[PDB]
């Protein structure tokens, strides 16, 4: 019997169930599809940043509650879609008392911020904050030492780039009892994505992506198979 595709939901993430796979294929399909969603989907994230009132890291920014550290982390969680491959730059300025968010961000053209309610930094009175952001495009996860020369050396800060629009994926493989055979494999897959793309879509691109690879092998003969 041909295999089915199912879905149990949640706004940001959902679980997918594939069954019945020919015995020993649940694992044949599992880890391969995960490393695809986590690495083989292009998005946009922050490469480097620049703060006005900073000449070294340990000191906090004049007028801000959070440390230099706790801001970077808040900024890594920022979700953004850029339209052009080449590195763009966006500016976020705000002064006085209150809280600065992702709706305060001034974006270029064809560049969208998808969670304008994300907290970033709690400014107090007489508190100034000017930040230059460097947004690129890529795949998966890229360290900070590899971005150590992407801003003006008057306070250029390298950031961990989380290009991937998929956040975390886990998978289990139980067995389904088809006919008399209890051997058949049942694949369960948990997928959490950013606020950028629906998980239901992130799979379809991840799915289509892999179809391309196995095209190469298939191209030779297209001999035999049945579904």
């Amino acid at each position: 019997r041909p295999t089915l595709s199912e879905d149990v939901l949640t706004d940001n993430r959902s679980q997918f169930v594939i069954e019945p796979l020919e015995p020993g294929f649940g694992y044949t399909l599992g880890n391969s599809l995960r490393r695809t969603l986590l690495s083989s989907i292009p998005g946009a994230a922050v490469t480097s940043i620049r703060i006005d009132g900073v000449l070294h890291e340990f000191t906090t920014v004049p007028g801000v509650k959070e440390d230099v550290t706790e801001i970077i982390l808040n900024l890594k969680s920022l979700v953004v879609s850029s339209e052009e491959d080449e590195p763009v730059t966006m500016y976020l300025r705000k002064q006085g008392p209150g809280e600065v968010t992702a709706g305060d961000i001034v974006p270029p053209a064809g560049v969208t911020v998808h969670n304008p309610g994300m907290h970033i930094a709690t400014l107090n009175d007489k508190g100034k904050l000017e930040v230059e952001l460097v947004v690129e495009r890529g795949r998966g996860y890229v360290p900070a030492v590899q971005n150590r020369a992407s801003g003006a050396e008057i306070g250029r800060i390298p950031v961990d780039s989380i290009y991937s629009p998929v956040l975390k994926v886990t998978y289990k493989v139980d067995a389904t009892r088809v006919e008399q055979r209890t051997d058949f494999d049942k694949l369960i897959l948990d997928v959490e994505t950013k606020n950028s793309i629906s998980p239901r879509d992130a799979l379809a691109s991840a799915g289509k992506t892999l179809v391309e690879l196995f095209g190469l092998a298939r191209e030779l003969n297209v001999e035999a198979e049945g579904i």
Partner: protein, 717 residues
């Protein structure tokens, strides 16, 4: 769950399947329905799949030393002819897979299945009725797998680095989701110390107060932590609501976690939680890299150096006896000591020379299994072997097993090893007999009432008094106090009462009494409560299994017998002492006890010990006759110094043990009375199981002892 063979089920549910065959018309009558099953027609496999729906069955594994030897499971049909078993009930059944067989019984009556699913089901009996400890816990691979990821590796890759120069802070992640993509790229080690913001794990009790003011942590509130990615993956199991643990998971650690969950969290939580812990270990025990090669097992560097030092000390002792300056009994007695010390120094040589990487040590030091003594025998040296008599041989096996034992070495070890198995076979037959006796003496002992109502209890030593100051936790605390319910309000120096009467002692209530400084509490016991038949629920107290008050009807007597008999195999005093006590024999030692309290008059002769006692209160001198082979017991005197041997002019209380050995409990009865003799027995019994590291709750011993004193003789008609 359990994996019940497709073939096995069909014969177990045979008239049950025949029923649904003539139901769904596969067979015209009951006779044909039979023939369909016996021919194993294809239909029945569909039929039977329905029949065994949530219909519990029994798993028994002989020998059944305690009641967890029979547990109920939800049967899962399975291809093959083997019974599939859950790795956590292995501790309860004492079941390994070197060819063990288990018996299955199919409950039929409505109440039977009810008794199965509710009383006996494996996911309910997670605790030992003997000590209340978690038997269904991570055991071998599991612990070794968890102990892996929860370890902190100093210089491992992806470790947190402070900012300095032109490079900022390396090793800070926004979320667990990020750190996971890091070890997948190959930047972050799952065992390297890092800093990560967390959103679905309540911080420590000490940090939550600092960061929230105990505003009540919430799924979504953020905070920063200094762990390893692994220790985070581990806390996603405990899961939410439970205070994060930042330690490495040794067995004793994990044991605490579950025991805590056993108290606070409900049963179905623990069952689900411990299951998650199982899956975790196995997956990580695989990628733990724990392997045995000839390489990992290393002989020490100081091997021949150390052994040449003691063989030289030996030859000195040989020549000192060659001149006949030494007694023969002294010669070996010293030779034993020389080689005992030597083996210790070989072990030391290993531990340090061995990296904590080393899988043989990783397994030992992590409580997964194995002793270091084993590891010593493997790569260090065997050491002393036992004589047929039992005494330790003057000659030592210098060879390790890695180096290969010499021909003459192998022989004598073998002698030892066989005599080992022989006694191991005899004690079982002994333990099993002592057990069946205990079972009979306490069958009519049941929880019949909810409360005796008497204020009678017994004193327990909560803690010792430090000479310098402060208080020291009493060692017997866990077995003699923790499960008891109070019989008298426990008050400190003030008029302030810390714990009420009718209140179960728990872990924090001992901490309340410990910090208050009070070191003695009167607690209700099975020895004291008096009821027509059996005992009462209130005096017994907390059923070690449930972790709550014992239900009315519990066959506490049998379970008490089981509790004491189940581990009676692991002894060397020894098991005879346990028998000699429970059978109340006039002991071997026969150490005297003082009839009346007064001033001691030591008048030793070289041919015979004689002890005289002058009555503190008026009275006439009472004098005893002692054989010089025994020696006077170092009793804790008024001087608060226990190590003071008996000396003349000392002061002894009434019934005080005069010399080392064992006291006749029949005299303790006539001298110190019915109550005191029960407490003597219980702790003398306990002392035996103490030595061999076995912890039974005083509760169980008391149940048996109670049934020894229920009769009184007839003096005059």
């Amino acid at each position: 769950q359990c994996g019940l063979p497709k073939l096995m089920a069909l014969e177990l549910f045979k008239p049950f399947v025949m029923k649904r065959l003539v139901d769904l018309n596969h067979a015209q009558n009951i006779k044909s329905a039979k023939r369909m099953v016996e021919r194993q027609r294809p239909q029945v496999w569909d039929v039977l799949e329905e029949v065994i729906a949530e219909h519990p069955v029994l798993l028994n594994r002989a020998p059944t030393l305690h009641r967890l030897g029979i547990q109920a499971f939800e049967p899962m049909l399975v291809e093959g002819k083997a019974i599939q078993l859950h790795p956590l009930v292995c501790e309860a059944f004492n079941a390994d897979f070197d060819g063990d067989q288990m018996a299955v019984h199919l409950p039929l009556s409505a109440e039977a299945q009810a008794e199965a699913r509710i009383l006996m089901l494996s996911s309910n009996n997670i605790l030992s009725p003997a000590s209340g400890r978690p038997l269904a816990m991570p055991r071998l691979d599991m612990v070794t797998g968890l102990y892996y990821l929860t370890t902190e590796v100093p210089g491992d890759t992806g470790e947190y680095q402070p900012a300095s120069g032109d490079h900022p802070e390396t090793g800070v992640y926004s979320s667990p989701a990020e750190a996971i993509m890091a070890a997948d790229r190959g930047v972050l080690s799952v065992r390297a110390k890092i800093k990560v913001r967390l959103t679905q794990l309540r911080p420590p009790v000490e940090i939550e107060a600092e960061l929230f003011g105990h505003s009540g942590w919430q799924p979504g509130d953020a905070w920063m932590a200094e762990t390893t990615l692994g220790r985070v993956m581990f806390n996603e199991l405990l899961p939410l609501g439970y205070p994060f643990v930042n330690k490495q998971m040794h067995k004793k650690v994990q044991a605490a976690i579950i025991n805590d969950l056993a108290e606070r969290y409900p049963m179905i939580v623990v069952a689900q939680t411990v299951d998650k812990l199982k899956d975790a270990g196995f997956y990580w025990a695989t990628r733990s890299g724990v392997t045995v090669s000839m390489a990992d097992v290393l002989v020490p560097p100081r091997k021949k150096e150390i052994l040449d030092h003691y063989e030289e000390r030996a030859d000195k002792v040989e020549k000192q006896f060659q001149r006949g300056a030494l007694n023969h009994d002294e010669r070996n007695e010293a030779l034993v000591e020389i080689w005992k010390e030597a083996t210790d120094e070989v072990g030391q040589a290993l531990r340090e020379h061995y990296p904590d990487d080393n899988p043989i040590i990783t397994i030992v030091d992590s409580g997964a299994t194995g002793n270091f003594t084993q590891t010593r025998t493997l790569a260090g040296m065997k050491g002393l072997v036992t004589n047929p008599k039992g005494e330790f041989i003057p000659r030592p096996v210098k060879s390790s097993f890695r180096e290969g034992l010499t021909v003459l070495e192998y022989f004598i070890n073998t002698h030892g090893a066989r005599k080992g198995l022989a006694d191991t076979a005899l004690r079982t037959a002994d333990s099993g007999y002592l057990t069946r006796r205990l079972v009979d003496v306490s069958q009519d002992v049941i929880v019949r009432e909810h409360d005796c109502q008497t204020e009678r209890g017994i004193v327990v030593e909560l803690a010792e008094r430090a000479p310098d100051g402060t208080l020291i936790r009493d060692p017997y605390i866990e077995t003699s106090a923790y499960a008891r319910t109070l019989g008298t309000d426990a008050v400190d120096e003030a008029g302030n009462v810390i714990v009420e009467r009718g209140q179960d002692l728990g872990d924090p209530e001992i901490d309340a009494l410990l910090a208050a400084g009070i070191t003695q509490v009167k607690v209700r016991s099975v020895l004291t409560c008096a009821t027509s038949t059996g005992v009462c629920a209130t005096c017994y107290g907390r059923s070690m299994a449930t972790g709550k008050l014992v239900d009315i009807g519990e066959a506490v007597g049998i379970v008490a017998a089981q509790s004491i008999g189940e581990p009676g195999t692991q002894l060397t005093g020894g098991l005879p002492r346990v028998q000699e006590l429970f059978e109340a024999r006039v002991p071997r030692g026969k150490a005297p006890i003082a009839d009346v309290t007064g001033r001691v008059r030591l008048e030793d002769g070289e041919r015979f010990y004689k002890i005289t006692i002058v009555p503190d209160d008026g009275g006439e001198e009472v004098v005893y006759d002692k054989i010089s082979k025994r020696q006077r017991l170092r009793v804790f005197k008024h001087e608060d110094g226990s190590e003071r041997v008996l000396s003349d002019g000392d002061h002894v209380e009434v019934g005080q043990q005069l010399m080392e050995g064992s006291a006749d409990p029949h005299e303790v009865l006539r001298v110190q009375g019915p109550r005191e003799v029960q407490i003597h027995l219980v702790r003398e019994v306990q002392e035996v199981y103490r030595a061999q590291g076995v912890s039974i709750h005083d509760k169980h011993i008391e149940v048996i002892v109670r049934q020894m004193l229920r009769r009184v003789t007839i003096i005059d008609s």
